[PDB]
Amino acid sequence: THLSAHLVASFIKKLARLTLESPPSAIVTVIPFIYNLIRKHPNCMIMLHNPAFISNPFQTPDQVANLKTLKENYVDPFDVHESDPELTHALDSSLWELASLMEHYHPNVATLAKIFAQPFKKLSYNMEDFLDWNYDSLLNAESS
């Protein structure tokens, strides 16, 4: 219960970069696991969307002058080489890697990444259902 935002967000982002080069059996463990922690800690919801960057119609044209220039000055503040987990600036960065993961070659893995466009309706996500899958069990259940 104690951990910070910066402590949890470092593990969510580092496992998210790790999903880029991973077997799909290792994805159906991480997507539930990232889904649990953001539901546990909703302060780190800011990396799934920064709503300063959303575009309303009912915002001022002078802010359009601001919102154009503000997006241009973005840099990714995340530092992979930093090993102190609270010190890494994963909170100030998003995680595009899970958004890319919605486009996936397997459907059921592409299904679970599509949770993150839908709302956070439930919490108890039961990882032991989704934890142990294998290349054998992916093939054996697919014809089944």
Binding site: L20, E21, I27, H49, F53, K71, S94, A99, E142
Partner: protein, 313 residues
């Protein structure tokens, strides 16, 4: 006509140069009498794989014109018989994956690569869930990551796979996360001889590459004739190492703008690959493909937005 061996053994009585139209006359006469071709289309799928397995000393003017015609025989049988081919393509995945359970490489055949390329020409490529292709592509995924790349043959036995997999998603253009794991595990094996990357967990330190290829425009290109080459790549000249790499350079570079350019995380995907591509152009300084890849990258590091997402809206 009834058994997979017996039609082949009847073809074995004839010569292989004339065995093609003998089955085609048998295919016409079985049509001249749906139930007979239920067995006969099953035998042709096994036998076309078997000709790739058997021998390939015959050249393209001696084998492939007889080989592509037998595929063209299936093309006239595919569109009427999708119930027949789905029963064999489901099982041959179940056969060859269970053979992969037996052996990590030994039950894997060089003719097995053709089985996926036949399907992608026959069956509906662009589909999300195809009852043949989606077991195949998730088997190809297993076939990518799990096998242990300790020889140049297995590199070429995997270099064909990207050329097959990208034809599945030339039109679907979906993402395949093991292929970037497949490319990174390839690129450092030729530069083993390092300190920048301990992350890749490569298979064997044995094969490398000296700074000794001339890499002309006349240098040998992709042209993968596996059942001429792969059985004897291990008897190794220096040219055949680089030419396999030079495919994987181009099977990367083509698929960047088709597939990798589309995804939003493209800025974070390719940054390990850039330093890998840096390690070629900083070392040899005379290759032109890495410098051309990196300038294609320097456009696409500037061209995209790379704005943080607002998925929860």
């Amino acid at each position: 006509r009834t058994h997979d061996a017996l039609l082949d053994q009847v073809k074995k009585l004839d010569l292989d140069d004339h065995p093609k139209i003998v089955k085609n006359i048998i295919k016409a006469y079985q049509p001249k009498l749906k139930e007979k071709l239920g067995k006969f289309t099953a035998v042709l799928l096994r036998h076309i794989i078997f000709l790739s397995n058997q021998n390939y000393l015959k050249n393209v003017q001696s084998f492939k014109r007889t080989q592509n015609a037998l595929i063209s025989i299936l093309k006239s049988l595919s569109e009427k018989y999708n119930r027949e081919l789905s029963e064999e393509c489901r099982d041959y995945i179940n056969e060859m994956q269970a053979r992969y359970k037996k052996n990590h490489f030994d039950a894997l055949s060089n003719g097995d690569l053709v089985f996926f390329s036949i399907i992608g020409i026959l069956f509906s490529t662009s589909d999300q869930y195809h009852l043949v292709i989606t077991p195949a592509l998730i088997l190809m995924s297993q076939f990518l990551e799990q096998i242990k790349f300790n020889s140049l043959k297995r590199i070429a036995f995997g270099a064909v796979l990207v050329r097959i997999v990208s034809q599945y998603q030339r039109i679907s253009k979906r993402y395949i996360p093991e292929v970037v794991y497949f490319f990174q595990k390839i690129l450092l094996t030729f530069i083993v001889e390092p300190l920048d990357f301990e992350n890749i967990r490569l298979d064997s330190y044995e094969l490398g590459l000296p700074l000794d290829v001339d890499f002309t425009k006349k240098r040998s290109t992709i042209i993968p004739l596996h059942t001429l080459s792969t059985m004897d790549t291990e008897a190794h000249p220096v040219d055949q190492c680089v030419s396999v790499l030079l495919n994987v350079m181009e099977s990367l570079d083509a698929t960047i703008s088709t597939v990798w350019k589309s995804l939003p995380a493209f800025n974070e995907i390719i940054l390990p690959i850039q330093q890998l591509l840096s390690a070629y152009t900083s070392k040899y300084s005379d290759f032109e493909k890495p410098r051309n890849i990196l300038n294609k990258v320097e456009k696409l590091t500037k061209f995209t937005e790379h704005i943080p997402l607002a998925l929860q809206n």
